[PDB]
Amino acid sequence: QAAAPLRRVVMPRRSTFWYEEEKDTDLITNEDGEDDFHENDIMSLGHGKLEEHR
Amino acid sequence: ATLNQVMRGCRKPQRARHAVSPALSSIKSPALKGVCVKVGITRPKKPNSGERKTARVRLSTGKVITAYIPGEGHNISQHSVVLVRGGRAQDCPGVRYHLVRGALDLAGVATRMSSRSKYGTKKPKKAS
Amino acid sequence: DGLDDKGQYQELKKRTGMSVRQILQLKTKKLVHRRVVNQTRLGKIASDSVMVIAGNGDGWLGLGMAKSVEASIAVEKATLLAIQNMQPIPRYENR
Amino acid sequence: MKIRRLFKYHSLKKKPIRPTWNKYNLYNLATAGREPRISGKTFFQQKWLAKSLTRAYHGEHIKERKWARMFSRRLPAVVNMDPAYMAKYNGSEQAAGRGSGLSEPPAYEKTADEKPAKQVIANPGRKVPTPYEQMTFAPLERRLDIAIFRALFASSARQARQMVVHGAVTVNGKKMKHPGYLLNPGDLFQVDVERVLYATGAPKDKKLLAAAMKAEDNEIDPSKPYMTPWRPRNYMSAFAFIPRYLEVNQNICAAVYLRHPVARPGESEVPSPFSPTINQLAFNWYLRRG
Amino acid sequence: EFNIVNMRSFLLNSDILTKILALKLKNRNARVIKIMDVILNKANLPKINRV
RNA sequence: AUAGAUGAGUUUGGUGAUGGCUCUGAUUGAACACU
Ligand SMILES: [Mg+2]
Numbered sequence: 001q002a003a004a005p006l007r008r009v010v011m012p013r014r015s016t017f018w019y020e021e022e023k024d025t026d027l028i029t030n031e032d033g034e035d036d037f038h039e040n041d042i043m044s045l046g047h048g049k050l051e052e053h054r
Numbered sequence: 055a056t057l058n059q060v061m062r063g064c065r066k067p068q069r070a071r072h073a074v075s076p077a078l079s080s081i082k083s084p085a086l087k088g089v090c091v092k093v094g095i096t097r098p099k100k101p102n103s104g105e106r107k108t109a110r111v112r113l114s115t116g117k118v119i120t121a122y123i124p125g126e127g128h129n130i131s132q133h134s135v136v137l138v139r140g141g142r143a144q145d146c147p148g149v150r151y152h153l154v155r156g157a158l159d160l161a162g163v164a165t166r167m168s169s170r171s172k173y174g175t176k177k178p179k180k181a182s
Numbered sequence: 183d184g185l186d187d188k189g190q191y192q193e194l195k196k197r198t199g200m201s202v203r204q205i206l207q208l209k210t211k212k213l214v215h216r217r218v219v220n221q222t223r224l225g226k227i228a229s230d231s232v233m234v235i236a237g238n239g240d241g242w243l244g245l246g247m248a249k250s251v252e253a254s255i256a257v258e259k260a261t262l263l264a265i266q267n268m269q270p271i272p273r274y275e276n277r
Numbered sequence: 278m279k280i281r282r283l284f285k286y287h288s289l290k291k292k293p294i295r296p297t298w299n300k301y302n303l304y305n306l307a308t309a310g311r312e313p314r315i316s317g318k319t320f321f322q323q324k325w326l327a328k329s330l331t332r333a334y335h336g337e338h339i340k341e342r343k344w345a346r347m348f349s350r351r352l353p354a355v356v357n358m359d360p361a362y363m364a365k366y367n368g369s370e371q372a373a374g375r376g377s378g379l380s381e382p383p384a385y386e387k388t389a390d391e392k393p394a395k396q397v398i399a400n401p402g403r404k405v406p407t408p409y410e411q412m413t414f415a416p417l418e419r420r421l422d423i424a425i426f427r428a429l430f431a432s433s434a435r436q437a438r439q440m441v442v443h444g445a446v447t448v449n450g451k452k453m454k455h456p457g458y459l460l461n462p463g464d465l466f467q468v469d470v471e472r473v474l475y476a477t478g479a480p481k482d483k484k485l486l487a488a489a490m491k492a493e494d495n496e497i498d499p500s501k502p503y504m505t506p507w508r509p510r511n512y513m514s515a516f517a518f519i520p521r522y523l524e525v526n527q528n529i530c531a532a533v534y535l536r537h538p539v540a541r542p543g544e545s546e547v548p549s550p551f552s553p554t555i556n557q558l559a560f561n562w563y564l565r566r567g
Numbered sequence: 568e569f570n571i572v573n574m575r576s577f578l579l580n581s582d583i584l585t586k587i588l589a590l591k592l593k594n595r596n597a598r599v600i601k602i603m604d605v606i607l608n609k610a611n612l613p614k615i616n617r618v
Numbered sequence: 619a620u621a622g623a624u625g626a627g628u629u630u631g632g633u634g635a636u637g638g639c640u641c642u643g644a645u646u647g648a649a650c651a652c653u
């Protein structure tokens with residue numbers, strides 16, 4: 001019963017972006033908030049200047 | 055027009071429109087028999103291109119018309135009795151009639167499978 | 183509920199004031215679709231002018247009209263305009 | 278001779294709803310789409326889709342030409358009049374104000390006032406729509422073979438048609454052999470009890486009966502077409518309903534055609550598994566068959 | 568020596584962006600215009616005072 | 619007799635008009651082709 005929710009196959013969202021053609025049901029998730037920006041990263045051009053400081 | 059102008063007969067029948075197949079529409083006939091005066095080829099007009107198989111038929115009423123031969127390959131020639139029906143070749147000028155394929159001398163397309171009733175083709179009977 | 187995957191009903195959600203789920207329950211229909219063309223210095227520019235209607239089926243109807251180079255975008259413009267231009271239509275016995 | 282139109286009668290791929298109690302039909306009826314897709318279809322493509330869906334059930338065994346003229350633009354209906362209202366009011370209050378009665382405050386003001394305004398005088402049960410669109414196929418409910426199937430005397434509209442053609446039905450005590458006979462209000466049609474028990478009974482199984490050779494209530498009788506003791510067909514409860522224009526008596530397998538099907542405010546008497554949206558397009562098709 | 572930088576959003580690097588959009592378009596039944604709109608909708612731009 | 623009144627394709631770079639043509643409905647004391 002504890003492992004039941006792990007093997008339960010999740011149905012992709014109706015209007016999905018990542019699992020529209022994914023045939024590996026193990027990776028299919030709810031997809032909610034997976035692309036929200038939490039203001040915790042900069043552009044690749046910024047990492048060049050940050051690595052320079054390190 | 056005023057009521058006086060109508061009372062004197064201003065309303066007249068609209069000018070008649072020419073029929074698609076006048077030789078048949080004039081006498082209310084669905085088809086007519088005729089002898090082939092000439093069997094040749096007609097060239098379509100500007101947009102289309104090719105060779106349209108036509109026949110100069112002398113109807114039993116005396117009129118000489120040009121009929122289109124539908125299908126691939128025909129059997130009629132000079133002095134051939136064929137049945138004519140209405141309907142015209144749109145791209146051919148003067149070809150205002152069609153020949154019936156299951157007619158007297160004109161034979162139906164032998165190697166025909168689809169729309170056999172349009173080309174007077176008996177069923178292959180290969181199953182029986 | 184993730185229904186709006188392109189944020190197209192965000193502004194319409196403010197004007198009208200109904201959830202996206204309630205917006206999708208309206209009866210929309212693309213009535214007219216014209217292929218208009220404008221002659222410009224750079225050649226012909228063909229657009230897709232469409233007209234869309236929206237209604238509840240219970241005394242509300244709205245007419246929207248928009249054009250665009252893409253037939254899909256014009257149908258969305260006209261749909262948003264049709265849902266915000268809805269008006270009450272008087273009916274005799276609601277029939 | 279089986280025509281091309283009856284090949285996939287209970288197709289699980291096409292899912293046509295037929296007028297029978299077949300188990301394949303029960304699955305097509307239960308799993309029918311909540312709403313056919315008419316979003317981007319043209320007006321003709323909608324009327325043809327609705328005509329194909331409805332004609333798969335209503336008058337399935339009747340030619341398209343015969344039903345095209347059997348279709349009637351006359352949709353009968355009735356209204357309920359409460360004697361208590363007609364005894365206290367003469368209808369004048371309905372013409373108050375400027376001809377349509379007094380005006381009531383808008384809905385956003387009533388609840389605001391803790392006191393609800395006095396109930397407006399009117400006949401009870403008003404301001405409820407009548408489903409006229411659902412009566413498109415009412416004329417079919419008058420045929421004899423259909424009435425037999427609606428009385429639960431047959432498992433299908435085609436099996437009931439055979440009972441008539443085979444002289445097993447009796448209208449007003451006289452033998453009737455025409456399935457197209459249009460019942461009149463008051464006619465009493467009666468089917469032979471033996472044909473009803475077989476039509477609605479369970480199939481005669483030899484394997485199970487072979488085990489029951491020797492191993493109120495009834496007994497076994499292998500000299501009858503149906504399985505004894507008589508038990509109702511499987512899945513017959515999912516189709517068990519009798520309309521209100523019939524008065525059936527199962528003891529003798531007889532029923533009376535009380536009246537014609539009518540539409541009442543908020544109810545229809547034509548058994549149809551389709552929504553008003555589809556019955557509205559089917560009606561619009563047969564206005565001019567195009 | 569490897570210096571692998573984990574990006575929180577695939578929009579912060581152009582290489583990873585054109586790669587994802589290309590995989591989506593490789594399917595025959597892919598709606599080109601619709602896929603571009605979904606990506607742009609995921610892109611959040613900060614508030615600004617134009618003046 | 620109180621339910622009975624409906625459209626569609628086609629002229630233009632495009633738009634709105636004008637105006638024919640054709641299709642959609644019903645039918646025959648019909649003919650022909652395949653049955
Ligand atoms: Mg031409």
Ligand SMILES: [Mg+2]
Pocket residue numbers: none
């Ligand atoms: Mg074929």
Ligand SMILES: [Mg+2]
Pocket residue numbers: none
């Ligand atoms: Mg000009």
